[PDB]
Subunit: 323 residues, 4 copies
């Protein structure tokens, strides 16, 4: 058993011990553990997935170096890896399609078991590790959540975007997720027009820096999108905020058949106008995290120079805890 | 110009004149004009699509006999036909995919121009007419809306149903639409379990008569569906009511990745729990009417004996105005 | 190490030893090992997948009883199970979507490692075992290949079938696979018309017994299908034979946009008329085996009485070796 | 009736008369009529679609200026337009989904009725005309076939390409179609690797000029693609040639689940290895022309500067007849 310095969540406002790996398990030395809006919802005790219990080391957005292995892990000590965060039960019909992210008995380091705000972290199986060929664990850490979630959301969006020669895609909420959502869209789709929506001028400026073509307050978005699309509307809106008001307003900006990809869940509920949605065949599609292939893909885009990290190192854009 | 007895909507609480057909236009003698919840929303002035104006003959659910033709109509006088209700502008990118039903400049007899609560009715083009080979116009009339809408909704549902060997499909709201939605599902899908939800015991009994396997109040639906699916949840919920509360409650009954098909729009808004929807990749898909192929298909199912009409004839289930 | 009586393939025209399970491995007592056309191609040395080597116990279509377990198997001794046959490497992008069946480094009992024509058989992981709640291992054995392959093929077909109200589906080649393909189609799709094609009158009779609506020689199929579909053509052809001539002829029977699902590979090549295929947007879609969910699904259909086995017990339709 | 100078096909090795438009018909002054490999197959009497008869003015790839209109045409004299080439019967289930291109009773100017190698040309309906806002009819003419066909083929490919972060796409045959296929792919997809295959060094050089990343002889393609994809294979192969040998060889280069999009039909048949296709779930998808939206889209890409024409003007890359 290995000693490790961590940050513990004990009540909703130092040095721990970590078991040695057996079977397929792997022990890693954390290089980076990203800080999510999800950590703050757990921190504030407004979100608790199955198996959650106190205390717990938070941090579900993790990269580092392999230091010890069980006899069945089949991985190389010294390799840098990013940790896929949603460890499915492997048995259910979702896991049997690689949809570990929507397994209802998933184990999540930092959300339901000990995570990355710690020197060392146990990983249940090497099957959850994606190799970093050249990207640093610190820069790679956000890919384990913000990156993968952005990719999974974009993949749901693609058929809606590909229907048009010059589609407008709305990205609502410019924070950690928008870093990856905007850059991934521009990396893949050469003829897309991205519109960034936020209430903060600072955030709108940042969306432009990330690669948004236009930015807007929500109230001004219709007049802009009308002009950009000759009244057609947006192909997709990726909602990184997810409140009653964001989805309602986004839905109305969509062209017929268009979709909101719901990633954010800051509100208790989401809402849509019944007439606009039913009459024009509009859609809302929930998106939680992504597949192992999605994580592989964002690592590859990053290592090939197509995505740039915007990270803020924080000693124990996106913030990253190092160690 | 032809004289005709109709029922006029003049304020929101006899004998008219009808132009002779030119070009591709066709004049029909109405055999049946169905009565919709949509007529009551227009009647009460809570719904007005583009081009709507007073006065107007309502009735958008129409069948009858061809009596006169323009020189370009290319149809046979004496043929019985059902009238496709959503006459697209033919020019837009939705009409160019046969998606006339979601054209934003559609002309609709009974909703935006004169309809079927009348002895005779002008049809803008023969392209909107589907032949009845043996079904009577009176029995066929509901296919022009309830039938086609049910088919379009089911077609959106199919890939979600086909994922499972023994899927539960929820049908919420047991009225005119449920007549066709339940029967069409059972006509196509041999191994489906249909659960009918309504607050009325009478309506629940009627759902069983139509072919539902089980019926339930919404509050009891979770415990039933849990038992029927070993906790998996429903594959699809077809919402024929469409209020803030119906969608919210239906969403929770779905298995991961499952969808609500939103057909009804009795409420101003619909709503969903943000966590349940985002975390489990659930969906809401708007459905308005269907394609000409959908209308052809429900006519064929009806003529082959696979759907039975539940109609109530009303001299000027589903009510039908005759003439 | 456990003694076991098997049948060995030593050259291309008794009693062996079997290792005890470790880690996730499971040892089963074979109840049924089905005999495939694939075994005969391996037997004749005309087919050898990666890792194949002599000698080898054939038989990739297996069910039986759990008798011993490794410490990590997490399964119950005494349970009856069917063995999923395509053991993926778990690492590749296909396995990460549960597509173990198309993993290029798959291990297959009876095709690349020791299989089921043997009293006992080692299974690499309990993850490859699907529980039989009530079906006997002998009756269940064909589900491990013929059944699952039929299901996977049908699942590719579904969107092509669901486009129509009264689709004709062709099933070409009436042998072991047709047992499941025909019955599964009829179990799922209530309004389908199945046309069975074979050169053998005996086989055509058997297709009718299995649930085909019509049967035909290939040369007579066009005139029949024309009559059944008013010249539209077939929605799908499932080719269980797969020669140069079968695909060529089947392609021509399809409606525009229709597909051949290629399951059989009795020929070296398949072929299609370039004009008919390109001009009418026809398709050919390869299908190898299925997912773990596909196996689960055919087990459930069988246990619910919706599929009937046609098995021939053979002491060491479909033949089954017992033990 | 209007006099016009044309080129007539009379046997398989000057001045005509053209009727005045009625109803929805439009008369155009040809600005450009492109020359296709299809014209040469008709010219040589190796291809004749329904309704074809001698004599006939060839040329199905047409743009020009509106000069006269029937009373129902609803278009503006003086407007420049490109002519959609596949005039569906409007009645069938394919036309009811805007799939005019696969209507079996289509009328095609230059293939089944008089076409564009002529000063003036009658267009059956204004519904077949797409407006040119700024592109010249001469430069626009190839969009009416090569352009639209490329777009339709790419649209079938997209879901296969979008599955990967860095997909290789093969384009086989570098002629008129490749001009648009290569440029459209690069216009839409920023992270694609295009491999051009041809037997001609000249054509391979031209593929590089058009935007291919690599070029190869077919025999050398496997070793290249293996290196480019770490042995995965190509996501898609667009076959602009379409012979027994091209499809066979292309199929083998594909990753599991990958597809050939069959556009070319230079051979009588196409062929595929049965084992490679069935075992790895590979596909062949026929593609004929595209939708009206596809034509709109390539016009827009061209007018926005994202596609460049490679045209050769020929007084009566791609050749264009002017007038
Ligand atoms: Zn997070
Ligand atoms: Zn699971
Ligand atoms: Zn209605
Ligand atoms: Zn329209
Ligand atoms: Zn087999
Ligand atoms: Zn694999
Ligand atoms: Zn051409
Ligand atoms: Zn047609």
């Amino acid at each position: 058993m290995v000693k490790s310095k961590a940050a513990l969540l004990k009540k909703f406002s130092e040095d721990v011990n970590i078991p040695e790996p057996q079977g397929e398990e792997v022990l890693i030395r954390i290089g980076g553990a990203g800080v999510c809006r999800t950590d703050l919802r757990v921190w504030k005790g407004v979100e608790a997935k199955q198996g959650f219990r106190l205390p717990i080391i938070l941090g579900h957005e993790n990269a580092g170096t392999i230091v010890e292995v069980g006899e069945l892990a089949k991985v190389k000590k010294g390799d840098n890896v990013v940790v896929y965060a949603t460890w499915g039960d492997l048995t259910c019909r979702y896991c049997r399609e690689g949809k570990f992210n929507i397994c209802k008995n998933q184990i999540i380091p930092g959300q339901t078991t000990n995570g990355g705000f710690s020197e060392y972290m146990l990983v249940k199986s090497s099957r959850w590790l994606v190799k970093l060929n050249s990207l640093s664990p610190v820069e790679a850490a956000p890919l384990a959540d913000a990156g993968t979630t952005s990719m999974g959301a974009i993949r749901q969006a693609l058929p809606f975007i590909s229907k048009f020669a010059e589609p407008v895609v709305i990205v609502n909420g410019i924070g950690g997720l928008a870093v990856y959502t905007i850059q991934i869209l521009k990396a893949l789709m050469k003829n897309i027009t991205i519109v960034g929506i936020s209430r903060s001028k600072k955030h709108r400026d940042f969306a432009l820096e990330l690669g948004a073509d236009y930015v807007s307050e929500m109230k001004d978005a219709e007049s802009l999108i009308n002009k950009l699309t000759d009244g057609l509307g947006a192909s997709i809106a990726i909602d990184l905020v997810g409140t009653e008001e964001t989805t309602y307003n986004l839905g109305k900006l969509l062209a017929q058949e268009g979709a909101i990809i719901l990633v954010g869940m800051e509100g208790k509920r989401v809402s849509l106008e019944a007439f606009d949605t039913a009459v024009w065949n509009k859609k809302l599609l929930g998106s939680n995290y992504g597949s192992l292939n999605d994580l592989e893909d964002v690592v590859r885009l990053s290592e090939s120079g197509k995505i740039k990290p915007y990270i803020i190192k924080v000693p124990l854009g996106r913030q990253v805890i190092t160690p």
